[PDB]
Amino acid sequence: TTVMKWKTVLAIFLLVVLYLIIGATVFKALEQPEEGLQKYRIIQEKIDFLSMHTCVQTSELEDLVKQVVLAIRAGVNPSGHPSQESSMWDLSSSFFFAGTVITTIGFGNVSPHTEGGRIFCIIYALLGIPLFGFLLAGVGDQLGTIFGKGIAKVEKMFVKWNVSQTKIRVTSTVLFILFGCLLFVALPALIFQHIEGWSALESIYFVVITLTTIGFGDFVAGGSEIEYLDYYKPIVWFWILVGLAYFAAVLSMIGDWLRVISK
Amino acid sequence: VMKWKTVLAIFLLVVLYLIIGATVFKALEQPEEGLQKYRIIQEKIDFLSMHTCVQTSELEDLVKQVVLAIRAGVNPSGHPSQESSMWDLSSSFFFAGTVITTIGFGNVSPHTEGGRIFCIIYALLGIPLFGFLLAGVGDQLGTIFGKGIAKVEKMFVKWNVSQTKIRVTSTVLFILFGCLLFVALPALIFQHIEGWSALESIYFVVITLTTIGFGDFVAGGSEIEYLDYYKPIVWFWILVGLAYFAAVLSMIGDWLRVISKKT
Ligand SMILES: CCCCCCCCCCCCO[C@@H]1O[C@H](CO)[C@@H](O[C@H]2O[C@H](CO)[C@@H](O)[C@H](O)[C@H]2O)[C@H](O)[C@H]1O
Ligand SMILES: [K+]
Ligand SMILES: [K+]
Ligand SMILES: [K+]
């Protein structure tokens, strides 16, 4: 029963509105030249195609472009030849989509695209999320206890050297943040970098988005039509599962930093 | 804090839930995909047969350019106007709110190596702050709801049933009131403004409030004229719905804790 007074919450609300306004202005400044280059590229490509081929007509070209856009919304890949029997909605991939929907990540790479699918998605999401929340809390507690006990043992071994009451806590917090961060985020980013054509920055951005639960869908593991291992979606989902508890703890630590900045 | 065995049992239950959901989704959704796959292949073959001059390699090059454009974030369906852009202040404000809220619609993404870094930094600092806002509003609403429950708690009138029946009825009434105010009335507003299917409107509202954020339907995705404050009002409704639902869930969680303590 925290019961923060109305003035405090409206202060936080004003802060949040300022935060979005600053974010919107910076994002507009960054995006506008890249968008301009994009707009020029597409206009130039359309003009070049029309000039190159007499047969093509603006109406027919627009119709083909519209059909391709509908295909992208549909989820079918227009490029080259799609395989009807394999490489789409594999038991692993559908499992991964179910894991994201319950996890709330929601990549958007694959969607129901049917009335029954949409109704199933709403019912399945509402039933699935409380269970996954309970599981996340339980896994977080178990991981926290095991990790803490391990730190306890390592510290107790190293407690005698350089004893300080400030340093013991600063070392414990820094050790937990870095040790968890390297395995949970740094190692998957490198593995993603090697397995797929994505650059290191893109891979790190992908890991931050999934662990953070934003799930933009700009980068999705397994999305590219390339050869994959037999069980790639389950291992990635399991990594997301273990990673989320630690990232939630990190979010709590940043929240604590914010509150302290409060006084 | 629960036993390790309980975590394994819940993990097994969630995995079985995921497998049954994945199988149902796969069976439910392969016919639509097949019809789509046939439609795209027929459209491409029809285009090739219709025009002799256009070769398959050129068609593939165009398809690759269009898919890159969709990934880039610029629609190719119609000739664009440089003055009007996707990264407008209202839309950028909506995207920033989406980032802090972890909805992650994904229609608009940084698509730049500086923008992506700013996105990770912005999301990490913003999200705990949004969490504190959500918790503060949730607890204030919980306090008003508790006072209202106490007000209706007295039952000296005719047909006063058990307290358990009363609490269940109050919870059901509150959930129905929230569902009507946020799940259904905005869905009708969205249906009116964007001409979406009646099922699609609730699907979008559930996804947005739930925070899964597939990106299939976005308030500002369609390129049609909109009110100047459409994106800010939509984000304001998202915040109000999330906060109210968070308050209701917190009240149920506290009551659940009490129930567990009892008997
Ligand atoms: C309890 C009544 C709900 C009945 C639902 C009937 C209509 C369906 C509308 C779906 C609304 C879902 O509303 C509920 O809101 C809470 C808000 O914390 C969401 O909770 C989510 O919030 C945060 C965002 O800050 C996420 O990072 C997190 O993954 C998750 O906990 C739930 O995912 C969702 O279950
Ligand atoms: K989320
Ligand atoms: K999300
Ligand atoms: K998302």
Residue numbers in the entry:
A (entry chain A): 39 to 301
B (entry chain B): 41 to 303
Text lifted from the article:
Tandem pore domain (K2P) potassium channels modulate resting membrane potentials and shape cellular excitability. Two key regions of the mechanosensitive K2P channel structure appear to control channel function, the conformationally flexible TM4 helix, and the selectivity filter. Overall, this cryo-EM structure exhibits K2P architectural features consistent with prior crystallographic studies: a dimeric channel assembly with each subunit composed of four transmembrane helices, a domain-swapped cap located above the selectivity filter, and an extended membrane facing TM2/TM3 loop within each subunit.
Using single particle cryo-EM, we first solved a 3.27 Å resolution structure of TREK1 solubilized in DDM detergent in an unexpected conformation. However, unlike all prior TREK1 structures, where intermolecular crystallization contacts immobilize the TM4 helix in an “up” conformation, the TM4s in our cryo-EM samples are unconstrained prior to sample vitrification. This density extends directly below the TREK1 selectivity filter, occluding the ion permeation pathway. The TREK1 protein is solubilized in n-dodecyl-β-d-maltoside (DDM) detergent and a molecule of DDM easily fits the observed density if the DDM is oriented with its maltoside sugar moieties located within the pore and hydrocarbon tail projecting outward toward the fenestration. While the positioning of this pore-bound DDM molecule is inverted relative to the orientation of DDM molecules in the micelle surrounding the TREK1 protein, the presence of a detergent molecule within the TREK1 pore suggested that this site could be a target for lipids in a biological membrane. Native MS analyses of DDM-purified TREK1 showed intact TREK1 dimer with a charge distribution similar to results previously observed for TRAAK in DM detergent, but did not identify any lipids bound to the TREK1 protein. While prior structures of TRAAK channels also exhibited asymmetric positioning of the TM4 helices, this asymmetry has always been attributed to crystallization artifacts and has not been considered biologically relevant.
